[PDB]
Each structure stands twice: as structure tokens, then as C-alpha cells.
Design a binder for this molecule. Structure first.
Ligand SMILES: c1ccc2[nH]ccc2c1
Ligand SMILES: [Cl-]
Ligand SMILES: [Cl-]
Ligand SMILES: [Cl-]
Length: 484
């Protein structure tokens, strides 16, 4: 058996936009994301699937049933977010020098919190309190994340930006967003600190910058192709994290971390290790060096950025294979997240419904890399597979959990494993077709079914271990019987 520390917790992660809607009174039309996925031109271009989030799994209304299943599954931790748009659906008065590039301080005080409170949607706040109270009543440890991609529409009209009009609300391209996000985070900690165990400011900030302004075929708003603006968005998202960290800490003593989209960079050949290091610098270290060490390029240290992190949330799905080139490195198709769907990679490893390669060793790589560089504790905040049939997920689950065990054995302080996700949900531009749940959702009835992987996870969580009887699942799904 592979046993975990007695304090180690198994659980799940979930996002508001992806899981909340689907039940009466739940629709939130007030985000960039809602506008984006409903846009007729985006649908005609195939940038978004045409599936609509309001037809989703209905956590807003059915949370007790989600929690009942998690409780029966033995889960002991959950990571969820509040949707900013639900709490502040309406424009706040303009505050503050918008032309100023750096935001080094956003003042928080009781009077300001009380004034913000006057603008908050009380029905939404109360409803989140009811959800989170129910969660805590299952004995679940609670990580509250402030931001998981959609912005209030009054801060970002993504169709205007897509069209190249920068005269309106421009999301992360504006320091106004940075300012308001810091205030929003402090406010949420002020209101919910009694229920929360740990905080994260944001989820996968690198995806917001990278897919929103470079990987524009992905269908991530605002889909405006610009290297320069991608950089501007990331610079702002970095100071927004630091100002949110300071804001939460002005009202709470609890740990504040961040959750990031990771890949394990792997060499095509034994001559490509320099490519790996470059890829890690360019996708990972530049960002964390900024919020941990204060190191940014203008190369300088910003005292207002340094030390703004207590823990690191690792989201890991697959590797990225890279090779050294004249001008630096390139990633290779046919491996990692760039494979055909339901096939095999160029390495002969099976791929998921999303075309993502089976590569659990990469999770050990990422955990140990972060540990060795920063020595901050971690949670695995996402790990999962698109697999409606459940053919690969039993192996995927056990294999990746084993690698977390290996990482802990090697010395890394990893305090939990949160699967993505408890139930199927709205997978952004791909819609409902990509099914990541331990529980399968029938979207017509909102009914939840247990995939056999859910029974496997119950064995792991309830025993706090990969037990002897399921250790054979620490292996690659047999490829012969799968499509290839
Ligand atoms: C669809 C796809 C990606 C997204 N990011 C934020 C909202 C949203 C909607
Ligand atoms: Cl990474
Ligand atoms: Cl350090
Ligand atoms: Cl369905």
C-alpha cells in the first residue's frame, strides 16, 4: 500500500462558472464569459462550442447532493471559488491614477469595506454562505479561491476588445481591474473568514494571459492576438495577486496562495536539457520569481511584490515535450496536450478524449521542482482526465496519486490532492463534451452517477492510501484495446 500522512487530505476542485448554473434562479449573465460564449460571431467561427453554461450541472441549487456524494466518497477537502460577478454585478463608481503603470498599494480599511458592502448583492452572499456552511458541516477543509477567469462585465467587454476597440472596459489590460480585484478579495475574506481554512487569490493566471491574447484559437476571451498585450495582462495580473494577498492579510491571518497551470517539460532527446530549463523559466519561474522574490523585468526587485505567497497550488494534466532550436526551443506536437483525441502519442502512450497524453511522472517532476526552488508547501489543486467512458481514469487517478506519494517521500511538503473534478462540468470553449467527473452528469435531469473511478477514489480517500487491492492501477492504461 502507499499510505499518506494522517493530515494529508483527498478531495476535489470545482469552479463557479463551470458548475454553478443549471438550476432555478442560478443564471449569471453578468460576466465577460457569459457574453463570450453566447456571442453569435464566436459561435459561427467555432471559437466556442455553442453549448451554454446555464444548462450545466446546477451546483447553485444542488450543492447538498454534490456534498452528500463527496462525503460518501470519503473526501476531506474542497477548493471552490466565488464569482465576482455574482457579488458585484453592477458598476462601482470610478475611484486613483489609471495612467500609472504600477499598483504598489491598495489601501484597505474598515470604512472602505463597509462602503463596498453597500454595493454587494446580499442574496448571492447569503447563498454562498449557505453553500459553504453545508460544506464545512461535512467535515471538509475549505480552500476559497477568489478568481477563476470570468470577470464582471462592467470590468471587461470582451467582444469590444476582440474587435480591436480599446475604449471600453478592458479587463486585465487595465489597472482599474487590479485595484478592484484587491478590494474584492479583501472584502470576501472579511465576509467569509469564519468558514475558510486557506485562500487562493486566483486560478491559472498564466492561462488568462496566454490563451486570451496569444492562443486565440482556444476560444478564451477576449481572443485578441497580441504579444504586447499578453505581457501587459500578465504584468497586471501579477500586481493584482500581490495587492489581493496584502488585502486578505489586512483582515485575515490565514494562508494565502495561488493556483497555477503547470506542465512537466521533458526533453525530446538527451541533447535537449537546456530546452527544458528555458521552457521552465519561460512558463513557470518568471511568474513565481515575481510574486515570491519580487523579481521582474523593467531586471529589478519590487519590494511590494516580494514575499506575497504562502503556498502553491499545482494544476497538472500532462507533459510538454521540447527541443532546442537555434533561436531557443519549441514544443512538439504529438506529445502532451498536443495529441490526437482518443489515440496514442508519438511515444505510444494513450491520449484522453481531449487529446492529452498519459504522463503521471510529470507530476512528481513539477512538485519536486517547486519544492527545491522555493520550499513552500503545496496542494495538488487539479489533476484529472477527459474520459466519459471511464476507461483510463482509474489508472490516471491511482498513477498520479502514487506520484504525489513519491514526491512526499522525496521530501516535498504536499498537503493534499484535489481531483478535477467531482462531477462533469462546462469546459469553457469545448462546452459539455469533455467530461472530467468522477461523477457523470446527465445534463437533461442534473442526475449524478458514480463512474467506477469514483468507487476507486472512495477506497483511496477512506483509507488515506492506495490500498494493496488497487495497486495494479499504478500503471499505463493498456493501449491495445483502446483506439489507436
Ligand atoms: C469561455 C472560455 C474561456 C473563458 N475564460 C473566462 C470566461 C470564459 C468563457
Ligand atoms: Cl509549469
Ligand atoms: Cl525563494
Ligand atoms: Cl448529458
Amino acid at each position: 500500500m502507499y499510505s499518506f500522512p494522517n493530515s494529508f487530505r483527498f478531495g476535489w476542485s470545482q469552479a463557479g462558472f463551470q458548475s454553478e448554473m443549471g438550476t432555478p434562479g442560478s443564471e449569471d449573465p453578468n460576466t465577460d464569459g457569459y457574453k463570450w460564449v453566447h456571442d453569435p460571431e464566436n459561435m459561427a467561427a467555432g471559437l466556442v462550442s455553442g453549448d451554454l453554461p446555464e444548462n450545466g450541472p446546477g451546483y447553485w441549487g444542488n450543492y447538498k447532493t454534490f456534498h452528500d456524494n463527496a462525503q460518501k466518497m470519503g473526501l476531506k477537502i474542497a477548493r471552490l471559488n466565488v464569482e465576482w460577478s455574482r457579488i458585484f454585478p453592477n458598476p462601482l463608481p470610478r475611484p486613483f491614477d489609471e495612467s500609472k503603470q504600477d499598483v504598489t498599494e491598495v489601501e484597505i480599511n474598515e470604512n472602505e469595506l463597509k462602503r463596498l458592502d453597500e454595493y454587494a448583492n446580499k442574496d448571492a452572499l447569503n447563498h454562498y454562505r449557505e453553500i459553504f456552511k453545508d460544506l464545512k458541516s461535512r467535515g471538509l477543509y475549505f480552500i476559497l479561491n477568489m478568481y477563476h477567469w470570468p470577470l464582471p462585465l462592467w470590468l471587461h467587454d470582451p467582444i469590444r476588445v476582440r474587435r480591436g476597440d480599446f475604449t471600453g472596459p478592458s479587463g486585465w489590460l487595465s489597472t482599474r481591474t487590479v485595484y478592484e480585484f484587491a478590494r474584492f478579495s479583501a472584502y470576501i475574506a472579511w465576509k467569509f473568514d469564519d468558514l475558510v481554512d486557506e485562500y487562493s487569490t486566483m486560478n491559472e493566471p498564466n492561462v488568462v494571459g496566454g490563451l486570451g491574447y496569444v492562443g486565440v484559437k482556444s476560444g478564451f476571451p477576449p481572443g485578441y492576438l497580441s504579444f504586447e498585450l499578453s505581457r501587459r495582462a500578465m504584468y497586471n495580473i501579477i500586481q493584482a495577486h500581490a495587492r489581493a494577498y496584502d488585502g486578505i492579510k489586512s483582515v485575515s491571518k490565514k494562508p494565502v496562495g495561488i493556483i497555477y497551470a503547470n506542465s512537466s517539460f521533458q526533453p525530446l532527446t538527451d541533447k535537449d536539457m537546456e530546452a527544458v530549463e528555458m521552457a521552465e523559466n519561460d512558463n513557470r519561474w518568471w511568474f513565481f520569481d515575481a510574486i515570491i522574490r519580487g523579481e521582474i523585468t523593467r531586471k529589478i526587485v519590487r519590494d511590494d511584490l516580494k514575499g506575497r505567497l504562502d503556498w502553491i497550488g499545482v494544476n497538472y494534466y500532462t507533459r510538454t515535450v521540447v527541443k532546442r532550436t537555434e533561436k531557443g526551443y519549441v514544443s512538439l506536437g504529438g506529445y502532451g496536450h498536443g495529441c490526437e483525441r482518443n489515440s496514442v502519442s508519438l511515444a505510444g502512450l494513450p491520449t484522453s478524449d481531449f487529446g492529452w497524453e498519459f504522463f503521471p511522472e510529470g507530476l512528481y517532476d513539477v512538485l519536486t521542482k517547486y519544492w527545491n526552488r522555493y520550499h513552500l508547501y503545496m496542494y495538488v489543486t487539479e489533476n484529472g482526465i477527459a474520459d466519459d467512458a471511464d476507461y483510463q481514469r482509474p489508472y490516471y487517478l491511482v498513477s498520479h496519486v502514487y506520484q504525489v506519494h513519491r514526491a512526499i517521500n522525496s521530501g516535498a511538503d504536499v498537503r493534499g490532492y484535489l481531483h478535477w473534478s467531482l462531477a462533469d462540468n462546462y469546459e469553457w470553449a469545448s462546452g459539455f463534451s469533455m467530461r472530467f467527473g468522477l461523477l457523470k452528469v446527465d445534463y437533461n435531469t442534473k442526475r449524478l452517477y458514480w463512474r467506477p473511478s469514483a468507487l476507486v477514489y472512495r477506497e483511496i480517500a477512506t483509507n488515506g492510501a492506495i490500498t494493496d487491492e488497487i495497486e495494479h492501477l499504478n500503471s499505463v492504461p493498456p493501449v491495445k484495446p483502446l483506439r489507436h
